[PDB]
Symmetry: none
Subunit: 288 residues, 4 copies
Amino acid sequence: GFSATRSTVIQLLNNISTKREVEQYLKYFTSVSQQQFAVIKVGGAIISDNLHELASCLAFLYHVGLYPIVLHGTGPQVNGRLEAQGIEPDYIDGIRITDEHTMAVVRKCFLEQNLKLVTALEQLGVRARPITSGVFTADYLDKDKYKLVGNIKSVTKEPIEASIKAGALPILTSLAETASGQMLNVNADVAAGELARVFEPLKIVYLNEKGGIINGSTGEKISMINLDEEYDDLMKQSWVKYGTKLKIREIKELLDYLPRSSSVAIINVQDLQKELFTDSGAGTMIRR
Amino acid sequence: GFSATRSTVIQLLNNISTKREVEQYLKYFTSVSQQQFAVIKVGGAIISDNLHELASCLAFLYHVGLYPIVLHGTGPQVNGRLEAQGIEPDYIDGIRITDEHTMAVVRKCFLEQNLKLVTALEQLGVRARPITSGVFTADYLDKDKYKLVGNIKSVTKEPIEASIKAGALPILTSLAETASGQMLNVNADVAAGELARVFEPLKIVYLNEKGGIINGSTGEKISMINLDEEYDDLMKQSWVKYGTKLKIREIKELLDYLPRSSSVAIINVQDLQKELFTDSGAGTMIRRG
Amino acid sequence: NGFSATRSTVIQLLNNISTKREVEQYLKYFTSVSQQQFAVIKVGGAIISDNLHELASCLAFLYHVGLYPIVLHGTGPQVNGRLEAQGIEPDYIDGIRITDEHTMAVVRKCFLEQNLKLVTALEQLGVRARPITSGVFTADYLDKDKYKLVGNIKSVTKEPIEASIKAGALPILTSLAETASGQMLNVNADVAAGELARVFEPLKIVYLNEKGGIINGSTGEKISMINLDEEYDDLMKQSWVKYGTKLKIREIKELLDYLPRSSSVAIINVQDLQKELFTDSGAGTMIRRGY
Amino acid sequence: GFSATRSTVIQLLNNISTKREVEQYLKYFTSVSQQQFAVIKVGGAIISDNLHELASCLAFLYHVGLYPIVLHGTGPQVNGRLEAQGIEPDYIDGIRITDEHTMAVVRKCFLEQNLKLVTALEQLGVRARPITSGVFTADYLDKDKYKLVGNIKSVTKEPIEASIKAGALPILTSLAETASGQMLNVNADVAAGELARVFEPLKIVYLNEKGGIINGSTGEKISMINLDEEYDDLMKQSWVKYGTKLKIREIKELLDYLPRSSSVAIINVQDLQKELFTDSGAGTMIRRG
Ligand SMILES: CC(=O)N[C@@H](CCC(=O)O)C(=O)O
Ligand SMILES: CC(=O)N[C@@H](CCC(=O)O)C(=O)O
Ligand SMILES: CC(=O)N[C@@H](CCC(=O)O)C(=O)O
Ligand SMILES: CC(=O)N[C@@H](CCC(=O)O)C(=O)O
Ligand SMILES: NC(=[NH2+])NCCC[C@H](N)C(=O)O
Ligand SMILES: [Cl-]
Ligand SMILES: [Cl-]
Ligand SMILES: [Cl-]
Ligand SMILES: [Cl-]
Ligand SMILES: [Cl-]
């Protein structure tokens, strides 16, 4: 699967002092099966604001023979559509309350974002498959409270494995279905975790536009978190917000389930290579 | 860029031998588009029974730069699965009564058949894209009677057009969605006719194992159906089973909308290349007339 | 060879096909397992300056369907323009350029320019081409006192041409020859192409010019067919058979004396090359022994 | 379209260790101008003695998108051929006296060596263009003394530049032509020096089997020659062989024209990549100082 374009060669010659790190991390990521390298979660905003960088970083991985499983959201675009129509979005515990009309908007938005990412990759000569259904099976998280929102109960691996075996990056929406075919909205961070539990990749990467987790009291970027030692302390800290406290609790539960060779990385999309192919990385890594 | 092997070019030359045929091929080969070449409906049984030949035929089309829109069924596999787990299939008027468990089976079988065909194509060097949702929008056909069965109200073309633009054959299931996201079961003959309605392709082909429609009173294959003359009579004949009635009604409604130059060919896969490259039909040809 | 039909190859192949007969003749070439060289094509030098894209396109078609021609080109007209611009009058006898030291310098520069133009035009269409500018033709002086630096070709070294083809590149040859000790000698491209056809015994022998064959000067009509055994002796006595036309006809007659009766030579415009190679054509001038 | 395999990229990464080296490689890898990366002179003996390693090294360069100008000799093969027909090689001052028959032997050997190297390269997937005339224009050096030997007066750059633009390594012999087309023999060290003068490449590399120049008084390889200081003294030393003297003089005269940042490396093929990718000299390095 390794086939370096001119662009790939140029990117590989970044931070040449780390070239032995680069070759070691390439070798490592390549040693496991093609479906156990990485789950990469993409925030919806990246597809609207930073599509070239997102497509380029995924093309880099593709061209060096790596097949990340790509799972994206679409939240900001949904809020845009709702707003144009005069409708305010509504969340509880960071989860969108999704009635029938809202689900219609969520579906349309997911499909548009999905095809945009797929097409941007194909324009770079990267084979990509839109996987928009048939992967996540769910029941209702809480119908009275969230309406059409899912709690994922099983994952069907076949579409992702087939894509990778055919030489195409699988590009998934985080939309789930009940077994009987009612589509149910699921938060992208949550859907990514479920993929990770089933595929057990070496890496789960959460891409954003803000960077890694920053310490409020000291202002410094948090490079690493050994969760066995630090979790109890970090959650006590009064600087961490509710939105950050929610993400970190579901990361803790994921890494408790996964083996210790798995790890999480929260990074700016433009720091993907630096995070993955150097010792010190770029954003926040989280180990158990 | 596009390239064709010696073997590909030899097979192409074996399929075209008149000025009209060459002109037709080149028109769609070099087409910057809007105009679609073909909608091909694939009977579900063909995926279980004759996959290599189906895949090989479609791969040849791809290797000569043609991009048919492919929609397949899965009815026979659903019946087998239901029967395997000790559940009796349930139909009314040739339409599957699809309760919640049945729909789960339908979805699983559709996905399995879809991936089987896509993967057979990839193995032959054909780029193929599964398209499993986001194309058909539907209302309930009759919720009390058929349960989770749809009546298609519109077709979203973008996924199909995006696949073709990227150089991948679009391989579609016939499942549709309500606007609020309830997936609904739709007979594949009906869904394929709705694709042909909105794309108005040069060729409209239905693949079955019988290679057409057989007249029950005579035991002879029907070569031609002139709908304007024969439709009302044909539909009153007691040998015409519900599945066939569903198909012919859809085709009749389709051909009422399309121009009189359009036709529908119900054929076996062995006659596909001849049906697509020439005007010398095979199997059962249906048109307005 | 490498058969790889691009979009343009497919279009070019099928555009003029309208019968099963035409389909069948293309199939004959594509399914053949013959090891005989497909073609020697002589290119009139003027075509490289006047119709380069079309020339390159036609040669590209052959390359893409795996039927590599051996290409030998001239450069006479642009040499004459160069000499004329320097206030020097071209000097010929019997179709052959009298070539003193200064003229040879001009000839060498023009050959190299035309050669690289053709090679580069092919490369720009994705066709690998190899300039072959020495090491093929070995010659003696034809007549030193009469013609000066002009060669009588004594042998053809095939290896350079065969290596090019084996590597997947069209061999693009100039018609200059060398004495054993390395004095380059000018040779008319019609003659040098004939020497290639003699030694390679190709299936097809085509001479490309702009007028599209040979014109009967008395009647003002393109000659469609020349049967040499019957017509040659009378042909050569005609008033309009002189200069370059006489040299051409004599060369082709001598070539065909050596080759089997099944061989023939077509003198055509490049626009008719595909039709004439593969299908039915009344274009240009066909020359054969006849019987 | 450019692609590189894993092993190619691994070998590239093994050759490049500093940021300076990265930027140097990128400058020539991404070039859209007429700048030249390298002129590499190949001793004739290497083509008979170590062809696979030479071809493999040049193929690596090609596979990382670098297009060195390659000029090779053939002296040892000519000597062998002359000796095979009972003729003693005849030199004066390191320059072959070349009568008509000797020229015929030189021409045939040059063509054979040239096609050997080109073909070795093509077998490794490298596009290579033989360039056997139309580059070097020369007068007679001294006709009474050396006979058919040339003094190069100009280099025509177009054939070499057209080759590189087409994605093919230009593989040159050192034969020259008088304006009126007499081929004249020219020592390959001199011809390669004339190429370096007009192309002003980043790297100037002479490949020989000894991997440099050995000091005869000590038996030790000379690592660095600083010409402004050492040239006059060096050329007086009685161990300095005919051929070596000619080479050192050409290089001295070449370096008088080039900027002081330039140098010439006389090395073995095993040190070629190190010499090209890094500024750590190997073998015998020559510069003005
Ligand atoms: C349940 C829920 O909040 N879903 C998300 C899915 C998109 C995303 O995560 O970006 C939403 O915003 O509707
Ligand atoms: C409603 C209905 O009958 N759907 C079909 C769809 C599959 C097919 O057509 O092959 C079914 O068998 O469930
Ligand atoms: C000897 C002779 O007439 N050579 C030809 C070669 C070029 C050509 O044929 O176009 C000439 O014009 O000099
Ligand atoms: C003039 C002269 O000595 N030429 C060299 C050319 C070959 C080489 O340099 O290897 C010779 O040996 O004839
Ligand atoms: N933020 C960090 N400290 N990252 C360390 C990354 C280490 C290594 N590149 C990896 O991906 O596993
Ligand atoms: Cl938002
Ligand atoms: Cl599904
Ligand atoms: Cl069937
Ligand atoms: Cl004509
Ligand atoms: Cl040597």
